[PDB]
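User: I'm designing a mutation panel for Thermolysin and want to avoid disrupting the core. Could you give me a predicted structure to guide residue selection? Please restate the sequence first so the numbering is unambiguous.

Assistant: Good idea. Sequence first, for numbering, then the predicted structure tokens:
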Amino acid sequence: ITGTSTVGVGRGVLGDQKNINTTYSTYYYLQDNTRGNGIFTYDAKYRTTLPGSLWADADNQFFASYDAPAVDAHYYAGVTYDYYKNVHNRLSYDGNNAAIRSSVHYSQGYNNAFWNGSQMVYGDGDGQTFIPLSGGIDVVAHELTHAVTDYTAGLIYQNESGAINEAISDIFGTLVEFYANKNPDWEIGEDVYTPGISGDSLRSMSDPAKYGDPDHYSKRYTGTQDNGGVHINSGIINKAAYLISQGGTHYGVSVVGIGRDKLGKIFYRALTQYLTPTSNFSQLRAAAVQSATDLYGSTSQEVASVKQAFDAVGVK
Ligand SMILES: O[C@@H]1[C@@H](O)[C@H](O)OC[C@H]1O
Ligand SMILES: O[C@@H]1[C@@H](O)[C@H](O)OC[C@H]1O
Ligand SMILES: [Ca+2]
Ligand SMILES: [Ca+2]
Ligand SMILES: [Ca+2]
Ligand SMILES: [Ca+2]
Ligand SMILES: [Zn+2]
């Protein structure tokens, strides 16, 4: 909508207070004009028709319980936009400042979030398995990164290319969590997952096997569930990414860590320059080695650590 840009205040899913960019035109709308062609947050009103209604508020204060998922969806979309612009010089998910749209209050008791090809969608959770999923910055950045992938490598969402697709979203979801310095870790979804159980998460990049996901190519899932295990076999790539950044010894192979920033540069270059819709794990290794070579040289420690990490998880 057309109107005057301003700043509102509210509280997010976890009770933290934050400022949010809004637009004033009779109502205050969750429309952020400061980032590209805009960030728009919609109310799905417990239905499944999308996008719903552009979020309208009478007084520019968002402290109601019903407001919390919208505040966080809106705010964390902005942080993720900032990450890609400031760190990778990318303007929104299409590289041309496409508008970012999110809908919250999707369905009833819906324990998931997703990119549907055009926008982000967030359930409120059932209060037991999940609380509203926009409360996790790594979740929001995970979903928005699916849009980046769709507009770049276009990895098909099945089998090995789909597991790469999932891992990319976990990797950059985590790097955004570190970028915002919001209690960062190498776990996925810990802030919104099982509010009754402390210390757990949906997936672990540092130790995928903690939750039964494979940490080595020999342990990959080969069945048909989960589109061929796109959320399961991502653990193999997640572990490799963790080893590249932090280092360690895994199945007897030692990796020297090179840090989060170089991990991000290497995988972003592989995603945007070398990966294709049908890339498999072996081709991801080649893309990451080539990207490390482009950036740091064929004889660099960086190239060495990429090779070691994929050796450690058994990807040749
Ligand atoms: O309080 C909530 C209200 O803000 C929303 O608009 O509709 C559902 C209610 O529970
Ligand atoms: O009002 C929402 C409620 O419907 C849901 O159950 O928990 C999250 C709240 O935002
Ligand atoms: Ca209000
Ligand atoms: Ca965290
Ligand atoms: Ca996390
Ligand atoms: Ca928990
Ligand atoms: Zn995903």
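For picking mutation sites, this is relevant: Residues 138, 174, 177, 185, 187-188, 190 surround calcium ion (ligand 5) (CB under 6 Å). The chain has two domains: 6-154, 155-315.
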